[PDB]
Design a protein around this ligand. Structure first.
Ligand SMILES: Cc1nnc2c3ccccc3c(-c3ccc(N4CCOCC4)c(NS(=O)(=O)c4ccccc4Cl)c3)nn12
Length: 127
């Protein structure tokens, strides 16, 4: 029971939207990060059971990962690009909360974060 239920990827009440920016977030931004050598720890919810991290969810109360973001984009869960960007941002800050500066996982997150900022600087004007 160490793992909480994963974040929702669809919700019957939450309104859905599609935009060219959200398409870009899936097809370019998420894809670019997903395929990076350092992606793997970020591709699914942290499994505190498999990784033997019994304190992870004692500390992190707003977990977020790229697997969840990918499904959310595929499901048109977000109203706009900012909601999606917020999830990526939570993902990175979580890592910096839980881990010490200079840990390998943190260096990985930092590299992905840099790339993320490069990609969202090219987010297209909404059409
Ligand atoms: C995200 C996140 N934030 N903190 C962590 C973290 C902190 C301590 C140990 C692991 C993590 C992980 C993490 C999540 C998944 C994985 N893998 C998923 C695929 O199957 C092999 C394991 C890993 N791999 S891992 O080999 O444990 C590892 C990765 C990076 C740096 C150090 C280590 Cl020891 C690491 N992800 N993570």
């Amino acid at each position: 029971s160490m793992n909480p239920p994963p974040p929702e990827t669809s919700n019957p009440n939450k309104p859905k939207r599609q935009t060219n920016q959200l398409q870009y977030l899936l097809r370019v931004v998420l894809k670019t990060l997903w395929k990076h050598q350092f992606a793997w720890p970020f591709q699914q919810p942290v499994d505190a059971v498999k990784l033997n991290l019994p304190d992870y969810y004692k500390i992190i109360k707003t977990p977020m990962d790229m697997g969840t973001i990918k499904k959310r984009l595929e499901n048109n869960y977000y109203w706009n690009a900012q909601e999606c960007i917020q999830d990526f941002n939570t993902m990175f800050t979580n890592c910096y909360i839980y881990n010490k500066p200079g840990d390998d996982i943190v260096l990985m997150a930092e590299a992905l974060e840099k790339l993320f900022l490069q990609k969202i600087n090219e987010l297209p004007t909404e059409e």
